[PDB]
Design a protein around this ligand. Sequence first.
Ligand SMILES: CCCCCCCC/C=C/CCCCCCCC(=O)OC[C@H](O)CO
Ligand SMILES: C[As](C)(=O)[O-]
Length: 431
Amino acid sequence: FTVAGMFDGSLYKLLLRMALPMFVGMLTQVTYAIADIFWLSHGIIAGVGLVFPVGMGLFAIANGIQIGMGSLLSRAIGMQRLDRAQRILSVGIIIALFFAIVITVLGYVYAQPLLRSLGATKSIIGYATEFYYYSLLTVFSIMLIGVMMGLFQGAGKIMVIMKASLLGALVNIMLDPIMIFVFDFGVKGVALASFLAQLSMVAYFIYTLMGSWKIYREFLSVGMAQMLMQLIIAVGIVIYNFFIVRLDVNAMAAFTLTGRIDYFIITPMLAIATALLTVVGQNWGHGNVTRTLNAYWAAVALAFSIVLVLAVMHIVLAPWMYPLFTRVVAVSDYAVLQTRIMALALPFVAISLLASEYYQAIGKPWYSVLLTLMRHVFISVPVVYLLAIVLEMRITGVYFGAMSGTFVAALLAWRLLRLSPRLLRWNQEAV
Ligand SMILES: CCCCCCCC/C=C/CCCCCCCC(=O)OC[C@H](O)CO
Ligand SMILES: C[As](C)(=O)[O-]
């Protein structure tokens, strides 16, 4: 339970030692697709891709369960009640269960209409429906992993998470071949290999692990706020796609190229965020508010610094890199212009995004959502409209408008994260 350096140590050492294992775990996740497509190399079943969004709303909900778990457990530990702690796992599991039932049941009955809003059946439907159904069979297990992730992240034991992750990636590496060759299962088999990978992780956790509406409310409010924030981010990407497409179809193709890469650059900040939840949550429970504030700015210093480097790499690399990805030069031009304009905003995203983690850690999701709304909606939409339409800038106007929310939100974070009477009162009420 202790997690050395938590209450008295160097915050940089503390956050890094926690965030680095978490980052390794995140790299394992990528290997799945690499191994999958490597073995898929040996037009009908390929509507598996149609069902891809469903897998992502499952990780999204699992993620909300994780932070609810992480947030609540880490405050209990810091308060030194391994008391509410065993309660929390219980309530964590029960919440995960009902979420799986509601999702499988509404999944099933509304299956037909839901699938319509994804893809067209002139060729792929029966393939689509089967995979949708197999996806439903994975829900409880995915939710279970959220609980477990939330359990070991709350206790600050990330090595168990990093080792679970590695075991999962090895399993998928070995099984993918066996499903193709021994069992003759095709694409289904690589999917099933990925899934037995996830269960072996689940197994690893439980084996390691061997040896009152108020509390549903506390868990549900943080956890569901996390889901609401995924949503807002997804919606902001929709409104962005809407504008890009109606202006120039090539800019929409450019974004399709930049997206995975823009996402990797941001991952080191997601790793630090996870570490910060534990440190804020536990120091908050222990009553040390100053240290939680120092913890946030230690995290911003790490995250900003790393992402700025990855961002600058992207910008200078883009002119040489993107032409290799496409022969249409309007598409590689748009991708280069987008990166050049928006890339430096990325490290600034750390300021408001870590601010969101802090409020989740201390049980105040309202300000988590406030900062996410401020970043992806309240500023961006009206400013993009202003710059891309009224002022006659077009795609260049989208790029500038869209990143203006990141700056305002960074301003907000900076103002809110500091000693205040209310913040100190909040900690009095907590302990
Ligand atoms: C969780 C991550 C949140 C970060 C989001 C802030 C984006 C600012 C810079 C990103 C440039 C790289 C991607 C370029 C296209 C991003 C589209 C986008 O983020 O749009 C923001 C706003 O919602 C418009 O409507
Ligand atoms: C109304 As209050 C407890 O957020 O100051």
